[PDB]
């Protein structure tokens, strides 16, 4: 695709079903102390779409159990929905607190 429009031009299919899981796979989570490249496999194996797995595919559990409904919101269309997966996991291992 040379010739045509000056710009760029590709209207068509807006995600990408590329990558998916078959086999049965174990259940993932992700913790203060996890990897920005676990992050990515929570994401998924949830069954969120790819437009967030790749805003939030980078930043490490800490960073991301930081970033609130807000946070979230922002970087990603789906962030009320990805947050509403994280309080499950920053409430295990720490919310209410003693002390």
């Not at 969120?48 to 805003?55: A, D, E, G, K, L």
Request: contains cysteine.
């Amino acid at each position: 695709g040379s010739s045509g429009s000056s710009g760029t031009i590709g209207r068509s299919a807006a995600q990408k079903k590329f990558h998916v899981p078959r086999q049965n796979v174990p259940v993932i989570n992700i913790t203060y102390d996890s990897t920005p490249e676990d992050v990515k496999t929570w994401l998924q194996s949830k069954g969120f779409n790819p437009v967030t797995v790749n805003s939030l595919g980078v930043l490490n559990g800490a960073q991301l159990f930081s970033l609130n409904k807000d946070e979230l919101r922002t970087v990603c269309p789906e962030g009320a929905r990805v947050y509403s997966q994280i309080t499950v996991q920053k409430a295990a291992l720490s919310g209410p607190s003693s002390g």
